[PDB]
Write a protein that binds this ligand. Structure first.
Ligand SMILES: O=c1cc(C(F)(F)F)[nH]c2nc(NCc3ccc(-c4ccccc4)cc3)nn12
Ligand SMILES: [Zn+2]
Length: 356
């Protein structure tokens, strides 16, 4: 039944590529926000994580929902790992010029996120206040990241996440992660780990001024140069279905979350979990011939199958930090993962009614 999957991918491709003023409205707003933040002492070097691509989408099915990252480089920071969480960190400074521009957000040794955010959110509030032309509103909701959600017009939503950028070596918790060696090669892994890493404000539970590692730039680089062969998806004789399988996994989850948004059992699942499981299947199946365009149906099924295995065993290691179990029962409880298991098996056994 790979014929249905192709049609699903065609609709999704058409929706995304259809002419839209959305990206241009959000560019206008983001560009005003950046200039106004660049005028303030603490945010002088703030900039876009992806330049030219204001249109990063979390929900592959929601074209009016945008997700942007404002990065700010911090030199010579000291990370202290928080509570053996492996992913969450206190941000200290080596502070050899003690007058670092973020000195105003200090609480002794420790960089305060809630303070940085409240000022970030206040500068942003002061520019969405001075909006010319089109109308935009700030929907300030809980959670440190995204910092704010902007609503433009009736349909457009922009999540803005603030991120510290570190150009030093990745924390030890990543040392055994990104296990792409038998897929993208050991030399690519080394290249990637020379790239910076990011830290976004975040709490482990739902108290403390912690930051969480973010590697969305590495995920993007992998997806756009994803084959074992350097020529994967350039020709037609080596055209693969890796990106299609990811889009199908994302769209399955988004459709099931929408189908059950009144029951809450699926609220903790996100794109992270499907992207992570996908990349694990990329390591398991490193050959481009295991992702043949013609095998879209079988390839999708391996992804669904592996995702179901993660759910039932309650194990899904973060791709960058192998000791962080995304499916631990402290993050998602057994009944929630068992609920999702049942719905996906119902989809697979009825030829995915969410793809009708
Ligand atoms: O940008 C990307 C892309 C991917 C991938 F594409 F592979 F999925 N994994 C990835 N891990 C990180 N940072 C570490 C980290 C991030 C998130 C959480 C978390 C925990 C609980 C709930 C929700 C999230 C824990 C640790 N960044 N990052
Ligand atoms: Zn490919």
């Amino acid at each position: 039944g790979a014929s249905k999957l192709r049609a699903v991918l065609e609709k999704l491709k058409l929706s995304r590529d259809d002419i839209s003023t959305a990206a241009g409205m959000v560019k206008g707003v983001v560009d005003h926000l950046l200039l106004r933040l660049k005028c303030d002492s603490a945010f002088r070097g703030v900039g876009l994580l992806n330049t030219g691509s204001y249109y990063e989408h979390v929900k592959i099915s929601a074209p009016n929902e945008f997700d942007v990252m404002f990065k700010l480089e911090v030199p010579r920071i000291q990370l202290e790992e928080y509570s053996n969480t492996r992913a969450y960190y206190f941000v200290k400074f080596k502070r050899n010029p003690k007058e670092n521009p973020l000195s105003q957000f200090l609480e002794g040794e420790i960089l305060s996120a809630s303070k940085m955010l409240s000022k970030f959110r206040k500068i942003i509030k002061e520019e969405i206040n001075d909006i010319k032309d089109t109308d935009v509103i700030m929907k300030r909701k809980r959670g440190g990241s995204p910092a704010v959600t902007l609503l433009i017009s009736e349909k457009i939503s922009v999540d803005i996440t603030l991120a510290l950028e570190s150009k030093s070596s990745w924390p030890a918790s990543t040392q055994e992660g990104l296990r792409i060696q038998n897929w993208l090669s050991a030399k690519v892994r080394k290249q990637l780990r020379l790239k910076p890493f990011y830290l976004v404000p975040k709490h482990a539970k739902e108290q403390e001024e912690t930051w969480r590692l973010s590697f969305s730039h590495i995920e993007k680089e992998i997806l756009n140069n994803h084959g074992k062969s350097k020529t994967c998806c350039e020709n037609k004789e080596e055209k693969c279905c890796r990106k299609d399988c990811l889009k199908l996994m994302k769209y399955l989850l988004e459709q099931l979350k929408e189908r059950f948004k009144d029951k809450k059992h699926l609220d903790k699942f996100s794109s992270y979990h499907v992207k992570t499981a996908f990349f694990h299947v990329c390591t398991q199946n490193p050959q481009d011939s295991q992702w043949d365009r013609k095998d879209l149906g079988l390839c999708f099924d391996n992804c669904v199958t592996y995702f179901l295995q993660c759910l039932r065993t309650e194990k899904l290691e973060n791709y960058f930090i192998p000791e962080f179990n995304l499916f631990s029962s402290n993050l998602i409880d057994k009944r929630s993962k068992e609920f999702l298991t049942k719905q996906i098996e119902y989809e697979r056994n009825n030829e995915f009614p969410v793809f009708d």
